[PDB]
Nucleic acid binder design. Structure first.
Lengths: 134, 95, 57
RNA sequence: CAGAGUGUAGCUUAAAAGCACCCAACUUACACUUAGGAGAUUCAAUUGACGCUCUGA
């Protein structure tokens, strides 16, 4: 399985989303699973657009497509689909686009690395985030 | 001597604002040196304005990206064209 | 003056001390990134080769 | 939270060393040189117990 992930930065503050309002008061980066018939970067951009609503410009692979199934794989408790799943990463820059909380998200803020929230762990782990920042 | 087993023992040929900007350039150069990249040349290009250059060649995409990020992390930049902000600086590449 | 010079030397020393720590930190950060990259490439190889190839380009 | 590899500061058929590294000056800058700077055997009697790397849950 394939999972695209982005890491958009501004003022040294990373952004976060709440898809599934009730379940996810906890935050993650704005990205779901792969999109067939479309290229990695492009797919990522599309995903971003769907969530954050902007034009987007992916720089390239920064230095950390994390994998995640290797290190701290999804939790055995609760019905979570624990399979072999790659976790591609991307560094990117926005050009223009105002935010809009509707449909597939509850909230959207920008936060420091040291000022980290609760965080899910299957998609993005705090440690993982730190590593990527480094 | 040619016919002796110590033939080519001697053989060697085959082995062979402005201030701020300047400082930034120096730093960049140092970084390059550290990371093992060929720094070819540096220029002293001409209110006032002042430009500095650090000519670089040969670096892989991931590594290159990392380098760029480090550079980003004041004044300005100019190399895909990758400009940014905080006199002048222009690290021209040749990947 | 003597006192000023003394002060200055100390200041310089302090600066030097500071700079090295920062440098070390930077190096560590770089290393982390490198490690991540290494991990990532391996993962890509394990999973799907075309994607890996694309990434490499 | 269960196992395996171990565990001299960045790194070594080192044994508290030598290489690396940092600041200033000379340097367009780099380089060289000259002055300075900072660093370590994770811890208790070859054994045990804290730290990583790695594999499971």
């Amino acid at each position: 399985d394939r999972t695209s992930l982005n890491r958009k930065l501004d003022r040294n503050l990373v952004l976060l989303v709440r898809e599934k309002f009730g379940d996810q008061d906890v935050w993650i980066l704005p990205q779901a699973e792969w999109q067939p018939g479309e290229t990695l970067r492009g797919t990522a951009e599309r995903t971003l657009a769907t969530l954050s609503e902007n034009n987007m410009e992916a720089k390239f692979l920064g230095n950390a497509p994390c994998g995640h199934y290797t290190f701290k794989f999804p939790q055995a408790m609760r019905t979570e689909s624990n399979l072999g799943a790659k976790v591609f990463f991307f560094k990117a820059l926005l050009l223009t686009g105002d935010f809009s909380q509707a449909g597939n998200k509850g909230h959207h803020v920008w936060v420091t690395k040291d000022e980290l929230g609760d965080y899910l762990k299957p998609k993005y782990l705090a440690q993982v985030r730190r590593f990527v920042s480094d | 001597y040619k016919t002796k087993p110590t033939h080519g023992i001697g053989k060697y040929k085959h082995l062979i604002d402005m201030t701020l900007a300047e400082s930034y350039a120096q730093y960049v150069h140092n970084l390059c040196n550290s990371l093992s990249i060929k720094v070819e040349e540096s220029y002293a290009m001409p209110l006032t304005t002042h430009e500095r250059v650090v000519q670089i060649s040969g670096l892989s995409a991931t590594f290159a990206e990392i380098f760029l990020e480090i550079i980003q992390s004041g004044v300005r930049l100019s190399v895909x064209x990758x400009x940014x902000x905080x006199x002048x600086x222009x690290x021209x590449x040749x990947x | 003056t003597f006192e000023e010079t003394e002060r200055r030397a100390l200041l310089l020393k302090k600066w030097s001390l500071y700079k090295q720590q920062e440098r070390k930190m930077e190096r560590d950060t770089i290393r982390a990134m490198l490690e991540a990259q290494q991990e990532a490439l391996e993962e890509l190889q394990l999973e799907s080769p075309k994607l890996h190839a694309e990434a490499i380009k």
